[PDB]
Design a protein around this ligand. Sequence first.
Ligand SMILES: Cc1cccc(Cl)c1NC(=O)c1cnc(Nc2cccc(C(=O)N[C@H]3CC[C@H](O)CC3)c2)s1
Length: 284
Amino acid sequence: TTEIHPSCVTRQKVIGAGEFGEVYKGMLKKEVPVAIKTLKAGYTEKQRVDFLGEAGIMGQFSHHNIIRLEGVISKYKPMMIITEYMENGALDKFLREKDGEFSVLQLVGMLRGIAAGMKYLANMNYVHRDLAARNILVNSNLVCKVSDFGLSRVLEDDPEATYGGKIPIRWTAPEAISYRKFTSASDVWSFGIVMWEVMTYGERPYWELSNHEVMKAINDGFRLPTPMDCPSAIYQLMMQCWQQERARRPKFADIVSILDKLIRAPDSLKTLADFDPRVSIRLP
Ligand SMILES: Cc1cccc(Cl)c1NC(=O)c1cnc(Nc2cccc(C(=O)N[C@H]3CC[C@H](O)CC3)c2)s1
């Protein structure tokens, strides 16, 4: 891991803030824009291990759809992790603020990028456990990159994860909820939810259903309905990600292949799944 001298880093604007540090937009020494995450003095041994552990994991990866680590400051205080800066922020908020502004082909291209990053992680034997649009970042080329790495810190730090242990119920596969079995196949389930988030421009999965109601619905066989304006092939793929039996789900290699083929023959995306209206408007 590259050790960066603190003189090389200029923090400029807060883009995120927790109890034990903040995330900043800044510049790294022409200077390049970076994101900078800090850990304030007084941190515990566990906080230090978790904090630097995220950088340790990220430093092992080199892929277009995985957030790139620039370096760390560990000799001086506060400690910092420095990464590339993703100008458009988190994917969930991005889509909610840009409702209806993209083509279907653009949305599917986002999903292909996410799937390629996840294929790489799975092949590298890294189980994400918290794949969700809120943990994808977007740059000024519309490239989506997987973020949020670590061991216990990932689910501990995510407010959407509630007390299995602490898990983000609406994104989590049944076996991970029931018996704590997190694998690349549970990440595939989560990817199906991400597909639904993207195609709905950031709708909250299951809407207002409670966590217990979501689990009951899934166990009874119910699944999220098709988004409006959703290609049939895309809805079919997300439904395959949500198979109860883990072994029946596609692997990320299969997902990447299908999405690639759909993008290469974009007319395939013009066939839409039927949308079930929740409102009836009748006029004579
Ligand atoms: C710095 C760093 C350290 C460890 C791991 C990682 Cl992945 C990173 N890098 C980053 O966090 C980021 C890289 N680029 C980023 N761009 C960016 C720009 C603008 C807003 C956000 C962002 O995440 N905003 C959040 C702030 C929290 C609120 O819920 C609203 C949504 C992110 S964050």
